[PDB]
Structure formats: C-alpha cells, structure tokens
Amino acid sequence: PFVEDWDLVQTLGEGAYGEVQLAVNRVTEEAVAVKIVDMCPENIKKEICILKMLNHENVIKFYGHRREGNIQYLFMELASGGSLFDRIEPDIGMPEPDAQRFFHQLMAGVVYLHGIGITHRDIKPHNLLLDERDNLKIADYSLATVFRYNNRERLLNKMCGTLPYVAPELLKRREFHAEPVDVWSCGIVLTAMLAGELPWDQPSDSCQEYSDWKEKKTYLNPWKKIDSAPLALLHKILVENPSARITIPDIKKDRWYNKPLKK
Ligand SMILES: Cn1cc(-c2cccc(C(=O)Nc3cc(N4CC[C@H](C(C)(C)O)C4)cnc3C(F)(F)F)n2)cn1
C-alpha cells in the first residue's frame, strides 16, 4: 500500500473514522502519520480547516492532505513515543512526577486550543500522544469544533466524546459551555494517570460510583490510591456544576500543580 511517494508500512491505530498508518517516504526516509478516511465530506472539510489552524508544541502538526478518488489521506506529525494510554499501568497508574509533567503539557495544549476558539471534545489517553523526548501532543480533531468566533462564544449541544471521560452537563443540559467539558476530561485523564483505573462508566444519576464521589467517599477506589495533594485538585476539577468547576487559570495556581516532584 502507498500514497504518491509514501509507503504505508504499519497500522498505528483504527477508530470511528478510518485508520492511522505509519507512512515512510521512499526517497527521504521521513516517517509521518497518515490518517486514511473513506468518503463525511463536510466532516473532513471542517477537520482539515481546524487542522490547518494548529501551531503549538503540545498539539499534533498537520502537513497536508491528498485525495485519491473517495479516499482522503491526512498527513500529520508522527508521535514516535506512542500513546499516553500505553504509559498507564492498569490498577497502578504511573509515577506522580511523570503524571504531573504530562498534566502540565496537557494544560499547555488545552490553553492553546481554547485560546484559538477550538474545543477538542474527546480528550483521553488514546488521543494524547508522545514524541521522541516524551512530550505530550494532543491528537485526533475528528470531533473538534469552533466554540468561539469573532470573540463571540457559541454554546454546544451535540453529544460526543467517550462516556467515562464526558462531563455530567452533556448528559443533563440542552446547551453547555465548551471549555469546562475539556477541563473535566483532563481531570479523568489525571485520575487514570495516578490510579490506572477509571472511576465510572459515565457521570450519571444511575451511576453508584459517581454518587459515591459526589458524597466524598474517597476511601473507595480509584481515589484511595491517590495522594492528598493531587486528590485536592481532582476535587476542584470533577465538580458536577460546570459554573462551579475550576478553570485552567486557577488549575495553574493549585498546590499540587506547583509541587516540586522527582522519581
Ligand atoms: C485517531 N487519531 C490518531 C491520530 C494521529 C495523529 C498524529 C500522529 C499519530 C500517531 O503517531 N499515532 C500513533 C503512533 C503510535 N506508535 C507506536 C509505534 C510508532 C513508532 C513507529 C515507534 O513511531 C508510534 C501508536 N499509536 C498511535 C495512534 F495514535 F494510536 F494512532 N496519530 C489522528 N487521529
């Protein structure tokens, strides 16, 4: 399999829309990631438009796109370190200094996206990739949308994301602000990094694990595996009411966020 001067050597991933392949240029040996999409045309039009805007060290770089009939090829920066998902040990997590470093980088990427009026809407460890120097890069803009245009905020109403990562207001409100939704998903990623376990299948009324958290039953898993300092931050992020939820400027003032750590 090939595209112009690129050979598609290895399947890096498969999902909701197509497949991601390792593309090696036959001449130069440059290795990039290629997203292959069958057909949706209005969806990829929006996606390419968002991808062309992205210019930040913690966000995946877009190189260009090629169309071969009904097949779209999206050329992007390769993340040679793979996914954050594969750095999380099930039921353990990872060393707290590594989690803190990845969390600072995630915040840097999210601040950038929010600053250009883009919401990711599917922040999770499978979408958080690592470069050669273990730097976090926010990937996959297939669900990404404009929430601010001409300095005017637009409320969202679409159901999207991944249930264990979604904010409770998506399930309970007709319309909601984009930024607290991405902040909430970052809090679930932090939980996964520190405990190697997700706290609930979804933050709904019927979910006992979610009710346990709202009742402050932190003697339960995954919370009992987390140190008091990052746990205090999680208590400010995983707040049911999005208007009461901590914002990224205040996360940057948090005690754990600013706590010196080393393995
Ligand atoms: C859904 N989506 C993904 C992307 C996306 C955009 C840019 C870049 C990547 C990417 O590098 N993906 C990747 C890489 C790797 N590895 C493992 C070995 C490999 C090597 C040879 C050691 O370098 C790097 C693993 N998984 C993935 C990923 F993400 F699951 F696909 N994916 C856009 N939508």
mmCIF file of all heavy atoms in Angstrom, residues 10 12-15 20-22 32-35 47 60-61 76-83 86 126-127 129-130 139-142, ligand 1:
data_model
loop_
_atom_site.group_PDB
_atom_site.id
_atom_site.type_symbol
_atom_site.label_atom_id
_atom_site.label_comp_id
_atom_site.label_asym_id
_atom_site.label_seq_id
_atom_site.Cartn_x
_atom_site.Cartn_y
_atom_site.Cartn_z
ATOM 1 N N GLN A 10 2.915 0.385 8.526
ATOM 2 C CA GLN A 10 2.359 -0.176 9.762
ATOM 3 C C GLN A 10 1.067 0.502 10.228
ATOM 4 O O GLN A 10 0.974 1.729 10.193
ATOM 5 C CB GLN A 10 3.439 -0.027 10.856
ATOM 6 C CG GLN A 10 3.176 -0.728 12.192
ATOM 7 C CD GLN A 10 4.248 -0.397 13.209
ATOM 8 O OE1 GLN A 10 5.432 -0.238 12.886
ATOM 9 N NE2 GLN A 10 3.857 -0.290 14.469
ATOM 10 N N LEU A 12 -0.995 2.024 12.918
ATOM 11 C CA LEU A 12 -0.766 2.634 14.227
ATOM 12 C C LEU A 12 -2.038 2.649 15.078
ATOM 13 O O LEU A 12 -1.947 2.655 16.304
ATOM 14 C CB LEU A 12 -0.176 4.052 14.084
ATOM 15 C CG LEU A 12 1.136 4.173 13.278
ATOM 16 C CD1 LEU A 12 1.485 5.621 13.023
ATOM 17 C CD2 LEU A 12 2.300 3.421 13.955
ATOM 18 N N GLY A 13 -3.196 2.653 14.419
ATOM 19 C CA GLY A 13 -4.499 2.658 15.073
ATOM 20 C C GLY A 13 -5.671 2.586 14.115
ATOM 21 O O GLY A 13 -5.514 2.839 12.919
ATOM 22 N N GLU A 14 -6.857 2.220 14.646
ATOM 23 C CA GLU A 14 -8.143 2.101 13.935
ATOM 24 C C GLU A 14 -9.250 2.637 14.859
ATOM 25 O O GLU A 14 -9.220 2.360 16.064
ATOM 26 C CB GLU A 14 -8.430 0.634 13.558
ATOM 27 C CG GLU A 14 -7.573 0.101 12.419
ATOM 28 C CD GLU A 14 -7.721 -1.370 12.076
ATOM 29 O OE1 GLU A 14 -8.124 -2.163 12.960
ATOM 30 O OE2 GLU A 14 -7.419 -1.734 10.917
ATOM 31 N N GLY A 15 -10.183 3.420 14.304
ATOM 32 C CA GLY A 15 -11.271 4.018 15.080
ATOM 33 C C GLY A 15 -12.546 4.354 14.326
ATOM 34 O O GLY A 15 -12.812 3.788 13.257
ATOM 35 N N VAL A 20 -5.136 4.947 11.089
ATOM 36 C CA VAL A 20 -3.907 5.745 11.128
ATOM 37 C C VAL A 20 -2.743 4.803 10.789
ATOM 38 O O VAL A 20 -2.601 3.743 11.402
ATOM 39 C CB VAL A 20 -3.700 6.537 12.454
ATOM 40 C CG1 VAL A 20 -2.313 7.190 12.510
ATOM 41 C CG2 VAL A 20 -4.792 7.590 12.635
ATOM 42 N N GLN A 21 -1.944 5.182 9.788
ATOM 43 C CA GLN A 21 -0.812 4.378 9.329
ATOM 44 C C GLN A 21 0.503 5.131 9.399
ATOM 45 O O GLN A 21 0.540 6.359 9.246
ATOM 46 C CB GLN A 21 -1.050 3.899 7.884
ATOM 47 C CG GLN A 21 -1.875 2.623 7.781
ATOM 48 C CD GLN A 21 -1.052 1.377 7.544
ATOM 49 O OE1 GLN A 21 0.158 1.417 7.284
ATOM 50 N NE2 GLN A 21 -1.702 0.230 7.615
ATOM 51 N N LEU A 22 1.589 4.384 9.618
ATOM 52 C CA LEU A 22 2.942 4.918 9.585
ATOM 53 C C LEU A 22 3.304 5.021 8.095
ATOM 54 O O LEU A 22 3.207 4.031 7.364
ATOM 55 C CB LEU A 22 3.921 3.992 10.349
ATOM 56 C CG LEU A 22 5.435 4.271 10.230
ATOM 57 C CD1 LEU A 22 5.819 5.583 10.900
ATOM 58 C CD2 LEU A 22 6.236 3.125 10.839
ATOM 59 N N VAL A 32 6.117 9.847 8.891
ATOM 60 C CA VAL A 32 4.989 10.666 9.348
ATOM 61 C C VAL A 32 3.797 9.740 9.646
ATOM 62 O O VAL A 32 3.856 8.546 9.331
ATOM 63 C CB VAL A 32 4.589 11.783 8.326
ATOM 64 C CG1 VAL A 32 5.779 12.667 7.938
ATOM 65 C CG2 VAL A 32 3.889 11.203 7.088
ATOM 66 N N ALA A 33 2.707 10.297 10.200
ATOM 67 C CA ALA A 33 1.475 9.539 10.420
ATOM 68 C C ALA A 33 0.453 9.982 9.384
ATOM 69 O O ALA A 33 0.332 11.172 9.095
ATOM 70 C CB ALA A 33 0.941 9.756 11.827
ATOM 71 N N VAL A 34 -0.246 9.018 8.788
ATOM 72 C CA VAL A 34 -1.266 9.283 7.786
ATOM 73 C C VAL A 34 -2.600 8.729 8.242
ATOM 74 O O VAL A 34 -2.722 7.528 8.472
ATOM 75 C CB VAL A 34 -0.874 8.767 6.375
ATOM 76 C CG1 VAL A 34 -2.041 8.874 5.393
ATOM 77 C CG2 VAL A 34 0.331 9.531 5.842
ATOM 78 N N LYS A 35 -3.599 9.608 8.345
ATOM 79 C CA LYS A 35 -4.964 9.223 8.658
ATOM 80 C C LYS A 35 -5.645 8.962 7.307
ATOM 81 O O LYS A 35 -5.679 9.840 6.443
ATOM 82 C CB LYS A 35 -5.695 10.323 9.456
ATOM 83 C CG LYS A 35 -7.093 9.897 9.924
ATOM 84 C CD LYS A 35 -7.888 11.053 10.521
ATOM 85 C CE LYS A 35 -9.283 10.609 10.890
ATOM 86 N NZ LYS A 35 -10.128 11.743 11.352
ATOM 87 N N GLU A 47 -12.673 19.321 9.586
ATOM 88 C CA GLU A 47 -11.495 18.750 10.236
ATOM 89 C C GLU A 47 -10.201 19.316 9.672
ATOM 90 O O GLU A 47 -9.343 19.714 10.449
ATOM 91 C CB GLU A 47 -11.515 17.208 10.167
ATOM 92 C CG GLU A 47 -10.419 16.553 10.997
ATOM 93 C CD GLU A 47 -10.389 15.038 11.005
ATOM 94 O OE1 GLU A 47 -11.421 14.410 10.677
ATOM 95 O OE2 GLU A 47 -9.326 14.478 11.354
ATOM 96 N N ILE A 60 -0.575 18.142 17.776
ATOM 97 C CA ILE A 60 -0.083 17.466 16.573
ATOM 98 C C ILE A 60 -0.071 18.435 15.372
ATOM 99 O O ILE A 60 -1.034 19.176 15.174
ATOM 100 C CB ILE A 60 -0.867 16.146 16.320
ATOM 101 C CG1 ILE A 60 -0.414 15.023 17.294
ATOM 102 C CG2 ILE A 60 -0.827 15.674 14.851
ATOM 103 C CD1 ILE A 60 1.040 14.406 17.088
ATOM 104 N N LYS A 61 1.047 18.464 14.631
ATOM 105 C CA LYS A 61 1.221 19.309 13.449
ATOM 106 C C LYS A 61 0.593 18.649 12.219
ATOM 107 O O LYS A 61 0.736 17.443 12.021
ATOM 108 C CB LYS A 61 2.717 19.591 13.198
ATOM 109 C CG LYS A 61 3.101 21.057 13.322
ATOM 110 C CD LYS A 61 3.833 21.354 14.629
ATOM 111 C CE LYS A 61 3.988 22.837 14.866
ATOM 112 N NZ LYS A 61 4.428 23.138 16.253
ATOM 113 N N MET A 76 0.184 13.974 9.017
ATOM 114 C CA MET A 76 0.426 14.622 10.300
ATOM 115 C C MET A 76 1.761 14.204 10.914
ATOM 116 O O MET A 76 2.299 13.144 10.595
ATOM 117 C CB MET A 76 -0.713 14.274 11.289
ATOM 118 C CG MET A 76 -2.097 14.779 10.877
ATOM 119 S SD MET A 76 -3.333 13.576 11.384
ATOM 120 C CE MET A 76 -4.785 14.326 10.796
ATOM 121 N N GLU A 77 2.262 15.035 11.829
ATOM 122 C CA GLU A 77 3.455 14.817 12.636
ATOM 123 C C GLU A 77 3.375 13.432 13.323
ATOM 124 O O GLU A 77 2.347 13.102 13.913
ATOM 125 C CB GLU A 77 3.496 15.935 13.698
ATOM 126 C CG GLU A 77 4.523 15.778 14.801
ATOM 127 C CD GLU A 77 4.491 16.855 15.870
ATOM 128 O OE1 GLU A 77 3.508 17.631 15.929
ATOM 129 O OE2 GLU A 77 5.466 16.925 16.650
ATOM 130 N N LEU A 78 4.439 12.622 13.219
ATOM 131 C CA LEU A 78 4.471 11.307 13.876
ATOM 132 C C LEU A 78 4.779 11.486 15.365
ATOM 133 O O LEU A 78 5.593 12.334 15.733
ATOM 134 C CB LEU A 78 5.509 10.357 13.224
ATOM 135 C CG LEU A 78 5.668 8.926 13.830
ATOM 136 C CD1 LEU A 78 4.423 8.045 13.575
ATOM 137 C CD2 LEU A 78 6.931 8.239 13.309
ATOM 138 N N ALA A 79 4.128 10.687 16.208
ATOM 139 C CA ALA A 79 4.364 10.697 17.650
ATOM 140 C C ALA A 79 5.056 9.351 17.905
ATOM 141 O O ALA A 79 4.393 8.325 18.086
ATOM 142 C CB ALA A 79 3.040 10.786 18.394
ATOM 143 N N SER A 80 6.401 9.356 17.808
ATOM 144 C CA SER A 80 7.225 8.144 17.904
ATOM 145 C C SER A 80 7.167 7.440 19.276
ATOM 146 O O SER A 80 7.339 6.222 19.326
ATOM 147 C CB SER A 80 8.664 8.409 17.478
ATOM 148 O OG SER A 80 9.229 9.519 18.152
ATOM 149 N N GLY A 81 6.847 8.177 20.340
ATOM 150 C CA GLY A 81 6.706 7.601 21.679
ATOM 151 C C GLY A 81 5.398 6.867 21.919
ATOM 152 O O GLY A 81 5.211 6.266 22.980
ATOM 153 N N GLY A 82 4.488 6.917 20.940
ATOM 154 C CA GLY A 82 3.187 6.257 21.019
ATOM 155 C C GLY A 82 2.182 7.015 21.869
ATOM 156 O O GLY A 82 2.281 8.234 22.008
ATOM 157 N N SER A 83 1.237 6.302 22.479
ATOM 158 C CA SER A 83 0.194 6.925 23.297
ATOM 159 C C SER A 83 0.453 6.945 24.794
ATOM 160 O O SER A 83 1.124 6.065 25.354
ATOM 161 C CB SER A 83 -1.160 6.270 23.032
ATOM 162 O OG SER A 83 -1.199 4.938 23.520
ATOM 163 N N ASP A 86 -0.552 3.689 26.735
ATOM 164 C CA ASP A 86 0.440 2.626 26.921
ATOM 165 C C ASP A 86 1.503 2.934 27.992
ATOM 166 O O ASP A 86 2.334 2.070 28.281
ATOM 167 C CB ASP A 86 1.065 2.240 25.570
ATOM 168 C CG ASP A 86 0.053 1.622 24.610
ATOM 169 O OD1 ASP A 86 -0.901 0.945 25.085
ATOM 170 O OD2 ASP A 86 0.208 1.812 23.393
ATOM 171 N N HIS A 126 -5.832 7.655 24.764
ATOM 172 C CA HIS A 126 -5.596 7.178 23.398
ATOM 173 C C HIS A 126 -5.364 8.322 22.405
ATOM 174 O O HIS A 126 -4.716 8.110 21.379
ATOM 175 C CB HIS A 126 -6.722 6.233 22.928
ATOM 176 C CG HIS A 126 -6.467 4.798 23.272
ATOM 177 N ND1 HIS A 126 -7.353 4.077 24.052
ATOM 178 C CD2 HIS A 126 -5.439 3.992 22.917
ATOM 179 C CE1 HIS A 126 -6.827 2.864 24.166
ATOM 180 N NE2 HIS A 126 -5.674 2.767 23.500
ATOM 181 N N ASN A 127 -5.804 9.557 22.760
ATOM 182 C CA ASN A 127 -5.637 10.758 21.915
ATOM 183 C C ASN A 127 -4.493 11.654 22.356
ATOM 184 O O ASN A 127 -4.246 12.686 21.728
ATOM 185 C CB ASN A 127 -6.965 11.552 21.834
ATOM 186 C CG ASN A 127 -7.956 10.841 20.971
ATOM 187 O OD1 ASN A 127 -7.586 10.037 20.098
ATOM 188 N ND2 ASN A 127 -9.226 11.106 21.199
ATOM 189 N N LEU A 129 -0.674 11.761 22.627
ATOM 190 C CA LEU A 129 0.499 11.056 22.109
ATOM 191 C C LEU A 129 1.808 11.648 22.576
ATOM 192 O O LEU A 129 1.828 12.762 23.077
ATOM 193 C CB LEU A 129 0.414 10.965 20.581
ATOM 194 C CG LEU A 129 -0.932 10.497 19.988
ATOM 195 C CD1 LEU A 129 -0.884 10.512 18.493
ATOM 196 C CD2 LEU A 129 -1.329 9.084 20.471
ATOM 197 N N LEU A 130 2.900 10.880 22.467
ATOM 198 C CA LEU A 130 4.221 11.304 22.924
ATOM 199 C C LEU A 130 5.211 11.352 21.770
ATOM 200 O O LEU A 130 5.189 10.457 20.920
ATOM 201 C CB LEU A 130 4.765 10.317 23.985
ATOM 202 C CG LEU A 130 4.153 10.228 25.407
ATOM 203 C CD1 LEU A 130 3.567 11.553 25.915
ATOM 204 C CD2 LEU A 130 3.206 9.091 25.526
ATOM 205 N N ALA A 139 -3.816 14.845 19.992
ATOM 206 C CA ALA A 139 -4.143 14.322 18.665
ATOM 207 C C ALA A 139 -5.625 14.089 18.471
ATOM 208 O O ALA A 139 -6.371 14.073 19.448
ATOM 209 C CB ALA A 139 -3.382 13.017 18.440
ATOM 210 N N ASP A 140 -6.034 13.830 17.197
ATOM 211 C CA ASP A 140 -7.386 13.491 16.748
ATOM 212 C C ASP A 140 -8.372 14.674 16.838
ATOM 213 O O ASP A 140 -8.958 14.925 17.892
ATOM 214 C CB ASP A 140 -7.912 12.229 17.487
ATOM 215 C CG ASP A 140 -9.247 11.694 17.001
ATOM 216 O OD1 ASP A 140 -9.817 12.280 16.055
ATOM 217 O OD2 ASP A 140 -9.724 10.693 17.573
ATOM 218 N N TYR A 141 -8.612 15.352 15.697
ATOM 219 C CA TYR A 141 -9.504 16.509 15.687
ATOM 220 C C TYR A 141 -10.820 16.225 14.963
ATOM 221 O O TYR A 141 -11.516 17.166 14.559
ATOM 222 C CB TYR A 141 -8.748 17.746 15.140
ATOM 223 C CG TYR A 141 -7.691 18.178 16.130
ATOM 224 C CD1 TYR A 141 -6.459 17.521 16.196
ATOM 225 C CD2 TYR A 141 -7.978 19.120 17.117
ATOM 226 C CE1 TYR A 141 -5.536 17.808 17.203
ATOM 227 C CE2 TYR A 141 -7.048 19.437 18.106
ATOM 228 C CZ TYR A 141 -5.841 18.762 18.161
ATOM 229 O OH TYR A 141 -4.948 19.046 19.162
ATOM 230 N N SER A 142 -11.188 14.926 14.857
ATOM 231 C CA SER A 142 -12.410 14.464 14.191
ATOM 232 C C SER A 142 -13.684 14.921 14.911
ATOM 233 O O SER A 142 -14.719 15.026 14.271
ATOM 234 C CB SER A 142 -12.397 12.954 13.957
ATOM 235 O OG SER A 142 -12.450 12.238 15.180
HETATM 236 C C1 LIG B 1 -7.089 8.721 15.978
HETATM 237 N N1 LIG B 1 -6.011 9.579 15.503
HETATM 238 C C2 LIG B 1 -4.692 9.419 15.692
HETATM 239 C C3 LIG B 1 -4.060 10.455 15.039
HETATM 240 C C4 LIG B 1 -2.604 10.735 14.980
HETATM 241 C C5 LIG B 1 -2.122 11.966 14.550
HETATM 242 C C6 LIG B 1 -0.754 12.159 14.502
HETATM 243 C C7 LIG B 1 0.093 11.127 14.861
HETATM 244 C C8 LIG B 1 -0.468 9.916 15.246
HETATM 245 C C9 LIG B 1 0.421 8.791 15.698
HETATM 246 O O1 LIG B 1 1.644 8.893 15.689
HETATM 247 N N2 LIG B 1 -0.250 7.713 16.154
HETATM 248 C C10 LIG B 1 0.211 6.595 16.883
HETATM 249 C C11 LIG B 1 1.535 6.158 16.931
HETATM 250 C C12 LIG B 1 1.852 5.002 17.654
HETATM 251 N N3 LIG B 1 3.166 4.500 17.694
HETATM 252 C C13 LIG B 1 3.521 3.171 18.195
HETATM 253 C C14 LIG B 1 4.774 2.816 17.399
HETATM 254 C C15 LIG B 1 5.078 4.010 16.463
HETATM 255 C C16 LIG B 1 6.566 4.180 16.051
HETATM 256 C C17 LIG B 1 6.858 3.515 14.716
HETATM 257 C C18 LIG B 1 7.533 3.679 17.115
HETATM 258 O O2 LIG B 1 6.838 5.583 15.876
HETATM 259 C C19 LIG B 1 4.322 5.160 17.107
HETATM 260 C C20 LIG B 1 0.811 4.360 18.330
HETATM 261 N N4 LIG B 1 -0.466 4.773 18.300
HETATM 262 C C21 LIG B 1 -0.765 5.855 17.578
HETATM 263 C C22 LIG B 1 -2.237 6.197 17.472
HETATM 264 F F1 LIG B 1 -2.493 7.453 17.847
HETATM 265 F F2 LIG B 1 -3.000 5.410 18.218
HETATM 266 F F3 LIG B 1 -2.687 6.109 16.213
HETATM 267 N N5 LIG B 1 -1.796 9.712 15.301
HETATM 268 C C23 LIG B 1 -5.112 11.208 14.499
HETATM 269 N N6 LIG B 1 -6.293 10.677 14.766
#
